[PDB]
UniProtKB/Swiss-Prot annotation, chain A:
Organ and tissue specificity: Mature tissues, such as adult brain, skeletal muscle, heart, and kidney, express low levels, whereas tissues and organs with significant populations of proliferating cells, such as fetal brain, placenta, bone marrow, and various glandular organs, contain significantly higher levels.
Gene Ontology CC entries for this record: cytoplasm; cytosol; cytosolic ribosome; cytosolic small ribosomal subunit; endoplasmic reticulum; membrane; nucleolus; nucleoplasm
SUPFAM superfamilies, per database record: Ribosomal proteins S24e, L23 and L15e
Protein name: Small ribosomal subunit protein eS24
Entry superkingdom: Eukaryota
Upper lineage: Eukaryota, Metazoa, Chordata, Craniata, Vertebrata
BP GO annotations: cytoplasmic translation; erythrocyte homeostasis; ribosomal small subunit biogenesis; rRNA processing; translation
Keywords carried by this UniProt record: Acetylation, Cytoplasm, Diamond-Blackfan anemia, Isopeptide bond, Nucleus, Phosphoprotein, Ribonucleoprotein, Ribosomal protein, Ubl conjugation
Swiss-Prot record, chain B:
Organism: Homo sapiens (Human)
KW Ribosomal protein (keyword) present: yes
GO cellular component: cytoplasmic ribonucleoprotein granule; cytosol; cytosolic ribosome; cytosolic small ribosomal subunit; extracellular exosome; focal adhesion; membrane; nucleolus
UniProt cross-references to PROSITE patterns, sorted A to Z: RIBOSOMAL_S4E, S4
Location of this chain's protein in the cell: Cytoplasm; Nucleus, Nucleolus
Residue span(s) of domain S4 RNA-binding: 41-103
UniProt-listed CDD domains: KOW_RPS4 (cd06087), S4 (cd00165)
Official protein name in the record: Small ribosomal subunit protein eS4, X isoform
InterPro entries: KOW, Rib_uL2_dom2, Ribosomal_eS4, Ribosomal_eS4_C, Ribosomal_eS4_central_region, Ribosomal_eS4_central_sf, Ribosomal_eS4_KOW, Ribosomal_eS4_N
From Swiss-Prot, chain C:
GO CC term (a single one): cytosolic ribosome
Chain positions with Phosphoserine modification: S152, S162
Source species of the chain: Homo sapiens (Human)
Keywords: Acetylation, Cytoplasm, Isopeptide bond, Nucleus, Phosphoprotein, Ribonucleoprotein, Ribosomal protein, RNA-binding, rRNA-binding, Ubl conjugation
Protein name as annotated: Small ribosomal subunit protein uS4
Amino acid sequence: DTVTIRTRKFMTNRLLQRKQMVIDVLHPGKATVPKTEIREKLAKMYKTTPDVIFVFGFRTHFGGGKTTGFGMIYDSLDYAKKNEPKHRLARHGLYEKKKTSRKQRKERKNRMKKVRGTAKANVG
Amino acid sequence: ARGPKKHLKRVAAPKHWMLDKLTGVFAPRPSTGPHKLRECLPLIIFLRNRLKYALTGDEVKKICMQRFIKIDGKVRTDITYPAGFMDVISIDKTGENFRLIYDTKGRFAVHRITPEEAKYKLCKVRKIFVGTKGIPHLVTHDARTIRYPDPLIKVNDTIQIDLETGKITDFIKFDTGNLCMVTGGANLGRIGVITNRERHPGSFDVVHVKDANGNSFATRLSNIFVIGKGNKPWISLPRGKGIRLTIAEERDKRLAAKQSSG
Amino acid sequence: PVARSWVCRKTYVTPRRPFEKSRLDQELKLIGEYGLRNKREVWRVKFTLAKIRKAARELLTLDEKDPRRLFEGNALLRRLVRIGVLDEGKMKLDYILGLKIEDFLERRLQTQVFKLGLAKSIHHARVLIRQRHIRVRKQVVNIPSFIVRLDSQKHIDFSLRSPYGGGRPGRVKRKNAKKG
RNA sequence: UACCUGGUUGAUCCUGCCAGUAGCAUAUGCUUGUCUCAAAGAUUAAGCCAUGCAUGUCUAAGUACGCACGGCCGGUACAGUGAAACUGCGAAUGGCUCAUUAAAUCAGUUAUGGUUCCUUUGGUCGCUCGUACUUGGAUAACUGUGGUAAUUCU
RNA sequence: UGGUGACUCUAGAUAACCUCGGGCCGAUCGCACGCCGGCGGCGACGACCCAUUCGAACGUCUGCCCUAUCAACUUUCGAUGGUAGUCGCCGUGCCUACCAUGGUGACCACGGGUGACGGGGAAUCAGGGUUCGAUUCCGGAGAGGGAGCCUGAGAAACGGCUACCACAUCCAAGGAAGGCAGCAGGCGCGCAAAUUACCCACUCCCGACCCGGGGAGGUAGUGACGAAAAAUAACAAUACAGGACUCUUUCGAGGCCCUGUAAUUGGAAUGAGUCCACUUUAAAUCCUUUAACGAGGAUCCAUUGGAGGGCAAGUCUGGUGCCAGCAGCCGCGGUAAUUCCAGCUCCAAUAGCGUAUA
RNA sequence: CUCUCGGCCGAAGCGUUUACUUUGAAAAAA
């Protein structure tokens, strides 16, 4: 019961449909608290469901008692699926990037440059 | 080069945008529009940097693409649209209204304004010409051309535009004793009464201005914007009243304003 | 093109004559008195004094009703009162020229840990700062040349995770308790 | 921190240079535990280049008869998603280097009343007195037949 | 009618012209659906001309390093000017015809050089100065060397084309294709300089575009270029033929303060490492935060130059004997070397310190 | 420093032309 949450710079975006704030966490003697742990204690603070809130940028200060981050609490899941970056949805299991390397795509791109109409979909 | 530049480096940006050194190589590069690119504030800097609504240069795209932003009453879906002086930014989803006026230190400012004032703006007349079967025109500093003006509008005056219709309602003329704002130079953002206008034919007119405290300054004529008739501003003014404090009393204001705490 | 800053600055000057007795002697007395490590920690505090003398010596040519002298000169004395080097009644711009190296070296965190009695020698303060046993108002400070300001002198203590103030013992006491 | 010191004679005082001294930058030697920033094939050869990548692009809104999928309903012009190709736009920016170049480049200051300007923003766009309830011919993608050792060839 | 400091300006009127290699006056797409066969509302593409924005171009004034073993240059072939035109986006010898004979020069023209791209700046510095500025920002130029074009608003464009000169790849010998002073990488050159790595998440740019792309750019790797912080031990009890403070004339009496060539004892503190986890991030690393282990010759050893003077610090010991060698300079070495080769000891800077050159 | 006008206070002219000095405004960011 030692880990406590305080949110400094609160602001409601009515045009991105979220409440964004700056989260100060005070763990006196433990490690940096995980982002899955703080999303429960913040959801109980703001009376919402922890699949809607998103935390990022947690930097523990020197000495080891405080931790500063950001945080944003959306309105629903569809708004938090439209207005949110894909990498911060991929940490919730909601967006799955494909499995191409960047050099495979440029080779496949520059090989069908050498080929006219419908044999471009054959290549690769 | 061969043909026009499309990038802006960050250190080469205007100083008043207040972009820090270490965020990138490039700065937002305003689109061509009504304002000079040295004299404007792009819409990405007003949303991300000043208002802190967005956090990246993709959220400004996501905000502007919901058509939530009207610049002078027309919806703007370009994030690098140059908003300039006396431009009204209406955000209706939240309910705020801003006007871009300079403050005392040569930058712009977040100046929240009432939606009863947001139906008009002032412009400064820049060239007046006749043509096309004898029909007279204006050209203002927003490139707004308003054909059939009042015959008593001349160059360097100030009109008042209705923003829903585009038409002139009433104007102020260039005279002594009129309240003016400086929109360029080292006295930028300063508000004072026109004292004197010295003519230099074949060169630039110098317009001596007098503060509301007594601080006289001068500018060239092109950095002069008539705001009010007499001493009453026809627009609102920022938190500071266009009166530049010297750095000694600007320090005294801080070291006496911290003593109201507890 | 890069988004990097290459703006750096050296913080010391080496003397013009390298082998000079009674320069060597005086700096060795200042190394031993204040627990410093090498000569470069004296040449660093000689350099910030020479920047303060030089800026006051420039401000003494402008007259008493200059704008720049009245602004920037009052902001120079304010810092020297704030870090506790000057006093408050000596805020003319000519008791700057009476400052010395020892006034600036008495304000390090090392000598203040020794002065408050949290150590028992000037070399015991270096280790107690450097082992992370010393905090200033909330924050563990790990640097001995941390110039203690005047308001942060009343809050220097023993760092609530440490075996000295906090209480959970170290590496050695717990192993000897295991062997008990 | 507005500084000097050894060297000419048996000894002296000078001219005067050599030599030391301190930064700063390129190389280099020996050494190198932690931690934060950070330059980096410029100098000689603006020498020569394997291989790979560095410039592409679709909204409701130019052109869809590819079943390539599937979908009502099967006389329903075109449900939709959409590769391809036509069309539009960009590729003139960014990146790299410093060979040229000495009133040249460039910097500050003015001028275009001696000129062009995609785009953006505003204007203007029944202002002309004289088959339209919609005009004409091709061409890709596609199908099918080929050439050449060989090319983003045709 | 309106203007400027000044128009041969802006408008007005009149007479005509208006290019078939044509000048505008819309045969275009979407979404909601309608009001009394008509009348419709929001957009998307266009579009001559004007204004604006982004520029570009051509000009004005003032300014630059070395050289006189460069003192006269320019003018057939445009050099300076005048007139008429051609061309060109336009002003002009820009170019052509006819004229005039001019134009620059010790106030350094003209010619040559530059280990010359120019600035913003950088090093040093009392004051004055001197030298560097290829290099991330602004401006110029150029894509092996000259030259000519197409397209387009914009290019004399080289990740466009056509030649020629120079190299050079394939070839079935008829032909075909080239351009790293982009990012990597290779060879060569040299005293002299990093990975054929990951990603569009950041900063921004391009496109029909909230969606795609970007060796721009970001992130890592190499990196003692360089700059910042900063460990390699602290403390206590004994003992000293150590010092100091009170007394004893002096011997000598003391936890009063200090010191160590105590490899004397003693626990207390901790990182460097090893390493679960979180955090960081596009995903990782690194640092920050925390488990657990982690120090007694705390072998978990600090080095680079020096000890004659300049100049801090040994005419100690052994070896060599004008040899080997040292030494920036002065000097050292011929059998007692304060100087070489070494051992010990001491000094200076210290995770850094020598050397060479500017 | 003065002449023709506007509400005694502003225009317009100067006086032989400058160098000097002081103020102003204009001078990219880093």
